[PDB]
Design a protein around this ligand. Sequence first.
Ligand SMILES: Nc1ncnc2c1ncn2[C@@H]1O[C@H](CSCC[C@H](N)C(=O)O)[C@@H](O)[C@H]1O
Ligand SMILES: [Ca+2]
Ligand code: NA
Length: 213
Amino acid sequence: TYDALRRQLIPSFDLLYGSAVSVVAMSVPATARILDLGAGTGLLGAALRERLPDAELLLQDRSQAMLEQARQRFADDDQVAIRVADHLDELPAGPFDAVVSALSIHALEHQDKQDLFTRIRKILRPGGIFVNVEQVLAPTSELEKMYDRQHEAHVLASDTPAEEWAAGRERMKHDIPIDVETQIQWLRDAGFTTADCLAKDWRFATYAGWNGS
Ligand SMILES: Nc1ncnc2c1ncn2[C@@H]1O[C@H](CSCC[C@H](N)C(=O)O)[C@@H](O)[C@H]1O
Ligand SMILES: [Ca+2]
Ligand code: NA
């Protein structure tokens, strides 16, 4: 229902979230310790749990209301913990095999994104992976209009309730997105040895940084 609405609002939901799960599964052991940053209702954590039954998940968000949905989703899961913290607050010490995030970090000022990527690398073990499923800006105003048309085309094709799309539009006014290549370069600046865009559908992209490989 909520998960159905996220699929209606997010072009290539299965490709982009699935790419995040696949790249983690190919980068970390079965028993990986994983931080889901801005976990919300725990959708990305849930996708990872489906693939990695033995992974320890820490779901972190500033919103207790969002994390209540995550607590309900993971009620019977003894390998899931929840932390209430802002991206800008001290991160959990870990170390972590993976730090993942979906549709959260684009809320931060650009300087705070650059600092967050560096702070994430500090809590990753050597060879650890950072993955972001992200809302990204087009590199030009003209291309941004085309990105917007492609997003609207998906929303309309998915028979999204008009009020939910209106609410989606209102939330996006507060967003501080940047182009995918700029923020992938920020991973290199943060000291990740490899950074790559795995999958992309115009405004939405899955990218990753590796802490040594
Ligand atoms: N500065 C910040 N610190 C922590 N969480 C933040 C944040 N800004 C936004 N968030 C959280 O980021 C989430 C964005 S919605 C995405 C939720 C989830 N990752 C999913 O894929 O469905 C919300 O849960 C919101 O509370
Ligand atoms: Ca948003
Ligand atoms: Na709760």
